[PDB]
Amino acid sequence: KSDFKFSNLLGTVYRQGNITFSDDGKQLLSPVGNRVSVFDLINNKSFTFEYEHRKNIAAIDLNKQGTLLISIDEDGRAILVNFKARNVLHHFNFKEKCSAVKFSPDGRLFALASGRFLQIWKTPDVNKDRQFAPFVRHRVHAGHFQDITSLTWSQDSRFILTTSKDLSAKIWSVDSEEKNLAATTFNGHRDYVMGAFFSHDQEKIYTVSKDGAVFVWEFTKRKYSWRITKKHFFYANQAKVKCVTFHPATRLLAVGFTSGEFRLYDLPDFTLIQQLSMGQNPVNTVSVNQTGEWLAFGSSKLGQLLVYEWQSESYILKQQGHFDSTNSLAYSPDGSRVVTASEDGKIKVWDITSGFCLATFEEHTSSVTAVQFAKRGQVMFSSSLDGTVRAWDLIRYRNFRTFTGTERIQFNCLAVDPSGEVVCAGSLDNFDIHVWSVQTGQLLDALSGHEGPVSCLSFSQENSVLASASWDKTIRIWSIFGRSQQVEPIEVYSDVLALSMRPDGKEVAVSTLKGQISIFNIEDAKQVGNIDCRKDIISGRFNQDRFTAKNSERSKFFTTIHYSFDGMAIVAGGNNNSICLYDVPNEVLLKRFIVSRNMALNGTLEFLNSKKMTEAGSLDLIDDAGENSDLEDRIDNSLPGSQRGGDLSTRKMRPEVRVTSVQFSPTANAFAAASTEGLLIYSTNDTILFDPFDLDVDVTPHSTVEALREKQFLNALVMAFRLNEEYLINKVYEAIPIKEIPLVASNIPAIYLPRILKFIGDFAIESQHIEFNLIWIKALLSASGGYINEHKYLFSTAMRSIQRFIVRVAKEVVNTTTDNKYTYRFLVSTDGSM
Amino acid sequence: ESRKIMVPPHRMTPLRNSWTKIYPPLVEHLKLQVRMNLKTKSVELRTNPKGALQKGADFIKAFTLGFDLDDSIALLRLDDLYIETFEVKDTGDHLSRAIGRIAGKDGKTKFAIENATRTRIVLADSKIHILGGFTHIRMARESVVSLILGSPPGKVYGNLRTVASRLKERY
Amino acid sequence: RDWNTNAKTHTIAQRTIRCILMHHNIAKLSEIPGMVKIVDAIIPYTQRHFTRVDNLVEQSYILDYALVEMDKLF
Amino acid sequence: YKLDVLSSVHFVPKPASTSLEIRVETPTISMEDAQPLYMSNASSLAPQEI
Amino acid sequence: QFKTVSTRTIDELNDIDFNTYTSLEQIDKELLTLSIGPRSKMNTLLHLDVIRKRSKPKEAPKKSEKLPFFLQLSGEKSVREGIAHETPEEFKVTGRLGFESHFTKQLREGSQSKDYSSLLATLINFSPAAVDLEIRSLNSFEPFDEIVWFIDALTQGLKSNKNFELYETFMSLLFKAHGDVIHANNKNQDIASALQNWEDVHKKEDRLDDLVKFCMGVAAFVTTA
Amino acid sequence: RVKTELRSALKSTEDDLGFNVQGLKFVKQQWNLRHNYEFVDEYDQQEKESNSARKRVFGTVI
Known part of the structure; x- marks a missing residue:
């Protein structure tokens, strides 16, 4: 159950820092803010x-064996x-802002540019165990005058070419014996040298600068002393060079400028390939494959x-992500893709497994507040x-209906009928709930009766009753269909945000601004039970606020909650950085997850460093944006x-850490939360965490394979379950033979049935x-498919991943x-x- | 050791005026010695005492086959290049319009084949010679054969577009 | 083409399409002027009907399920 | 735009425009984003719209 | 936490000791079984014209005109292993005996020995572009010999119940590429014999059809009602 | 008996529905590769398909 590890981060394919390919150019490693994604x-x-990391990362490398990674953030x-x-080996703090880190080609060294020092370290072994301090220093070189902007190793790991902000680029030898082979610097540029590369045979050096020159350096005479034989210029006027790379085997110079434009050249000729x-935003990152056939670019501003x-x-x-802008999310009916509604006005359908x-859909002129699926995966x-x-x-990827009110109000929550006849939506400035029909596009009615902005709506998926909940401290249950037109008000203690309905429609849990979750019965509208949720919340202290986190009233409540699909748990999150999941029958906290440990976001630390508080203000409130x-x-x-407008540059303040929507996965034991870093995806894998079920002294792995070798297949299978x-x-599941699949499948006990169903689900998606x-599924459904039918919500996230296997791989094959x-x-x- | 290569009676005066751009890759780049024997209308390439001769003879054979100077030098360098010679052999019907079906109006079908699969095709009256990489020659030959043996031009043009894309594609 | 746009009278249309297809020469059927602006009108209605009749076949297995329950019965 | 980002996008919307947008008939493979996969392979016009 | 330790008892079945179980390739030879690879290979190979037409940029890139023709061939010396960078190993048919591709040579040798197992290993090995390019150029002219060699290659391959989504998508690629010649010289004896024994082995795949029909109809009935 | 005869009739009609789908689209495919036009450039080919695709006018709401 409750041992959810961090699995994935959907949205935000790229944030800041350098893109790297693997050696076999299959995966690319992309810096999301403090994490690293591998696609x-x-x-x-x-x-x-x-x-x-504790801040947004800035440099990446892994060696050519693909075996260990090093990531550096912006300090x-x-x-x-x-x-x-x-699993992380070591944390090492270089003391100052490192522009680039780069392994050797032969692997045994690496070198990084920390300010004006090129410092070369030697790599630890992967098979050596951990030490106190595994990094051994090779050297620290200082020749430059200002910061270094780049490194480039030679083909054989012998020379290293660094480019500085000072207008030169130097060549350094790794060992002390060849000091006289690399003693030259390469002057002559007008602005920042953004790259310096070797040719294939290391007998030319191309040095590309910021303003748009590329010099060609050869070892000739006018003795021989590293002349420049040619200068080529990009002639981009208002744009200028932001990131360069050069694949010397195929002679390919890729340049990305500060206007979105990348040009790629064949270099000793300088012909525009x-x-x-x-x-329109600048190109912050270019990397090339090892075969040189793929180029990976990254622009930091829109995060693409x-x-x-x-x-x-x-x-x-x-692709393109969303930083600090996701107003909602919704899983598809097969939990295979997440549909994300984002503040810049667009819907995006993110595949989960491949990130x-x-x-994407952009027909909204302004921000999208809520997304919700309907008609079982056909409409949204x-x-x-x-x-x-x-x-x-x-x-057909089309917008087939648009429902508007006659009042031109802005809607902040919606809820769709089960059989998608009726869509209702409620605003934050109108107090009515607008009910449109979906077939005829008209406004069917407007439900009035709240005296505060309708904060959250839901439709009960079984008996089709509408639970609304508004800031007048009131939840309110409307029987809409079938001659009744009945309203039932339930008073609550404080003003409701985040109502969620039980899967079987018997109950409804609201969040309140006291920071409590009150779970009501619907038919007899009484409080079945509440959870007190304001002390198990991690509310950080902002950099600009003058009141402690213990006393801050900003984010000690949950603005979005969701029931589990069996109906026994609740995941919840808000404008704080803790997402908590509770179980409702005991009303206790199962687990509380920290959504981010970044210091470049705002509401993270509860306790700010008092070295930054000076005799005039904090030191993170000084705008060093004129430097x-x-x-x-x-x-x-x-x-x-x-606050919360558009375009993060137009805000002056650090982005706060917040969660806007949480969802439990309809198919496999996961939840997703739409934070500011991205769609955080948490799930439990069962390769770890030995968690047995009523075993005994004689039930063992060796005993299971002995019963399998002496072929009692039912005994072997239930020993495996225990x-x-x-x-x-x-x-055991692959050792059972086809003739006695249906005997074993009829004789599995009633308690191990959801175990085998969820195993067959999450196995057969990929195997x-x-x-x-399909033989096993046909045997199990024919054997015990009355038990499943009458225990629907027990097998509701296991049978729903079975028809993510049938309709998505098996029906495609057919x-x-x-x-x-x-x-x-x-x-x-x-x-x-x- | 030596090689002889004849010069046909249609590529002798272009060879003569562009001879000054032919011999230095036979003499200072590759280290052979050369003489054009006007008597037997050939060229003798010998070695000196100070395996290059086959590549030099292939460069000269490209020039005598009728590829220009630059395409002959493209075969001279770029060791992953080949050149395939075949007659039609597969008169009013089968010959007087098959090579017009290859070439097309103003040479545009041969040009579309050339650009789609990155080969250079020289077309005689009935002798087709294809310069390029191995798979490039393979797809060019299949296209040429398809429309000498009779296919819709819409079919062979769609196959040329698909062949261009899948020849440039990785994975 | 316009009997196919129903779902009640589409079987007659599909049978006549089948006898035209398996009794005529395909090159002639294609090269009549006007016989692609009809077959673009009765590919997608036929694709819709193939999906619907396939779905009726798929939901026809409640009889097969009721049989396996009536066999399990004792 | 800058009035809304100043007004912290609580605002009131413009009324309405019954505009007219056409759509060509194209595969929804081609109406997608660039990634190795796809999501639907129907055509962007219905049978009755054809 | 960085390696895996064996749960073997000290004092003073390597898979079950190391807590793994690498799932066996196919369980029984009478069982249909997909391929060990990405799931998306079937959809990519079926739709890689419209997928790549999506993947095109919107307007042409402003290149230079003085660009060398043989630029893809003008590399130096991290090698490329694509189908365009193929080298021949060691009297005019479309592919001679000095210019034969590895696919055509393995197809012809499997046609001699009536066992295309090395051919099917080669097809399952290489990429979607190379698969499309090899099924694209299969000598569809004079005796249709190489087409029926590919047909009974697929028939032998899907007789063995492995990789069969790849064998069905290869047959769709063949029928889509030059099913016009198979339709035209339909009634040819070699093509009709190859297709008849292909259908003779392929008619027994309705197991999977009524299997997924039963599981779909019953699982939907069980889940809703 | 109801099961076998019913599903026999339903597969009997989906047989000729599938046959006509593949047959009519083979007719369309061979007419297209007979005489549609001949662009080798991908951009000009997609401009031709954009100019010759079916359009329909839909009354949207802003």
Whole structure:
């Protein structure tokens, strides 16, 4: 149950820092703010590392063996991670702002640019155990005068080429014996050297600067002493160079400028191979594959990530996230993609397993407040601040209905009928609940009776009653259908935000501004029980506020809650950085998760460092934005009293940490929470956490495989269930033969039935034994499918992942073979004569 | 050791005026010695005492086959290049319009084949020679054969577009 | 083409399409001027009907389920 | 725009416009975003719209 | 936490000791079984024209005109392993005996030995672009020999109940590429014999159809009503 | 008996529905590859398909 680990981070493909490819250019490592996401683009799946920096990260590398990673944030706090175990080895604090870190090609060293010092360290072994201090220093080189902007190793790990903000670029040798091979600096530039690269045979050096020159350096005579033989210029006037890379095997210089435009050149010739644009924001990052066939770009401002093959001109992916803007989320009816409604006005359908956005929808002129699915995965209704509830058909990707009121008010919550006849939506400035029909697009009625803004709505999925809840401390139950027109008010203690309905529609749990969760029966409208939830909340102290976190009244309540799909738990979160999940029958806290440990966000620390408080204000309230290098981020475009508007540059304050919507997954034991860093996705995996179920002294792994070898298959399977080890359940499940699948499946006891159903679900999504798993499913449903029917909500998140296996892999396979059957029949039954 | 290469009676005066751009990759780049024997209308490439001769002879054979100087030098460098010669062989019907079906109006079908699969095709009256990479030659040859043996031009043009994309694609 | 736009009178249309297809020459059927602006009008209605009749086949297994329950009965 | 971002987007919307938007007939593979996968493979016009 | 320790008893079945179970490739040879790879390979191979037409940029990139023609070939010396960078190993048919591709040579040798197991290993190995390009150019002209070699390659392959979504999507790629020649010289004996024994092995895949029909109709009845 | 005869009739009609779907789209496919036009450039091909796709006018609400 309650041992949810951090699994994934949907949204925000890229935030800040350098993009890296793997050695086999399959995965790309992209910095989300303090995490690191790894997208495998071939096996279409993705994860996010569980470790966390205290600030937004700025530099990334992993060595060519793919075996260990090092990530540095924007004040030098590096973290070294064992890659294939996903578990952090060491934390090392370089003391100052590190521009780039880079491993060696041969792997044994790395080198990083900390200010004006190039410092070369030697890599620890992955198979050596942990030490107190595994990093051994090779050298620290100081030749530069201002900060270093880049590193480039040679092909053989012998020389290292650093580019400085001071207008030169130096070449350094690794060992002391070749000091006289690398003693030259490369002057001649007008602005910041943004890159310095070797050619393939290391007999040319190309040095590209900020203003748009690229110099070619060769070892000739006018002895031989590293002349510059040629200068090429990009001639981009208002734009200037932001990130360069060079793949020397295929001779490819990729440059990304400060106007979105990337041009890529073939370098000793300097011929424009291609030139196009990511967008309008500057291109902060370029990286190239190891074969040089893929290029990955990143623009930090809208947070967008490209990888683009350039031989074929075709975007491998062109994605874009959302920082500090997600007003809601909703899982699909098969919990395979999350639909996210975001403040810049758009809906995005994020695939979960591969972390990329499938479709996006922008027909709202202003911010979208709420998204909710309907008609079982066909339509998706969304209500917005421009005064529209509009329906989206996810089959033809169209907006087929737009519902407006006659009053032009901005809707802040919506709720759809089960059989999607009726859509209701409630505002934060009108006190009515607008009820439109979906077939005829008209306004069916307007339910009045609240005396405060309708904060949250829901429709009961079974008996179709409408539970609304508003800031007049009142929840209110409307029987709309069938001659009644009945209203039932329930008073509560303080003003309700976040109502959620039980899955079977018997009960409804509200959150209140006291920070309590009150669970009401609907039919006899009494309080079945409350949870006191204001002391188990982590409310941080902001940098600008003058009152402690113990005394702050800002975020000690939950503004969004969701029941579990069996109806026994509640996940909840708000404008604080703790998401808490409770179980309702005992009314106790199961677990409380910290949504972020970033200090670049605001409401994180409860206790701020008193070294930053000075004799005039904190030191994180001084705007050091006039010390910036260039005008486009020296500009202060933050018009004054703006909270939650648009465009994060127009706010002047650090982004607060907050959760706007939580959801339990309809198929597999997970929840998702829409934080500011992204859609945090938490789930339990059962490869770890030995959690047996009434075993005894004689039930063992060896005893299970002995009963399997002496082929009592029912005994072996229920011994595997009692151990509750997933590899044992898998091993016995594949050792049972097909003739006595239906005997075993009829004789599994009634308590181990949801175990085998959820195992077959989360196994058969990915495993290749399609006919075996459908044999098991047919045996189990024919054997005990009356028990499932009458214990519906027990098997409601296990049977719903079974028909995420049937309709999404098995029915697709059947569609392909049915196409082959009818093409065969037509191609051999007719007459193609002349 | 030596190689002889004949010069056909349609590529002798272009060879003569562009001879000054032919011999230095035979002499200072590759280290052979050369002489154009006007008597037997050929060229003798010998080695000196100060395996290059096959690549030099292939560069000269490209020039005598009728690829220009730059495409002959593209075969000279770029060791992953080949060149495939085939006659039609597969007169009013089968010959007087098959090579017009290859070339098309103003050479645009041959040009579309060339650009789609990144080869260079020189077309004689009935002798087709294809310069390029291996899979490039493969798809060019399949296209040429498809419309000498009779296919819709819409079919072979769609196949050229698909072949261009899938030849440039990774994975 | 316009008997197919129903769902009540589409079976007659599909049978006549089948006899036209398996009794005529396909190159002639294609190269009549006007016979693609009809087959674009009766590909998608037929795709809708194939989905619907396939779904009737799929929901026809409650008889198969009732049989396996009546067999389990004793 | 800047009045709304100043007014902290509590505001009141503009009334209405029954506009007219056309849509070409195109696969919903092509109406998607760039990633290795897809989500639906129907066409953007219905049978009755054809 | 960085390696895995064996749960073997000290004093003073390597999978069950190391707490793993690598799931076996296929359980029984009479059972349909998909391929060990991405699930999206079938959909990508079926729709990789319209997927790539999505993936195009919106307007042409402003390139340069003085660009070398053989630029993809003008690399240096992290190698490329694509189908366009193929080298031949070691008298005019479309693919000679010095210019034969590895796919055509393995197809022809499997046609000799009547066992295309190495061919099917090669097809399951390489990429969607190379699969499309190999099924695209299969000598569809004079005896249709290479087409029926591919057809009974797929028939032998899906006879063994492995990788069968890949064998069905390869057959869809063949019928989509040059099913016009298979439709035209339908009534040819070699093509009709190859397709008849293909349908003879393929007619027994309605197991999976009525299996997913039963599971769908019963699971929906059980879940709702 | 009801089950077998009913599902026999339903698969009997979905047989010719599938056959006509693949047959009519093969007719359309061979007419297209007979005489649609001939762009090798992807952008010009997609401009031609954008200019020759079916349009329909839909009354939206702003």
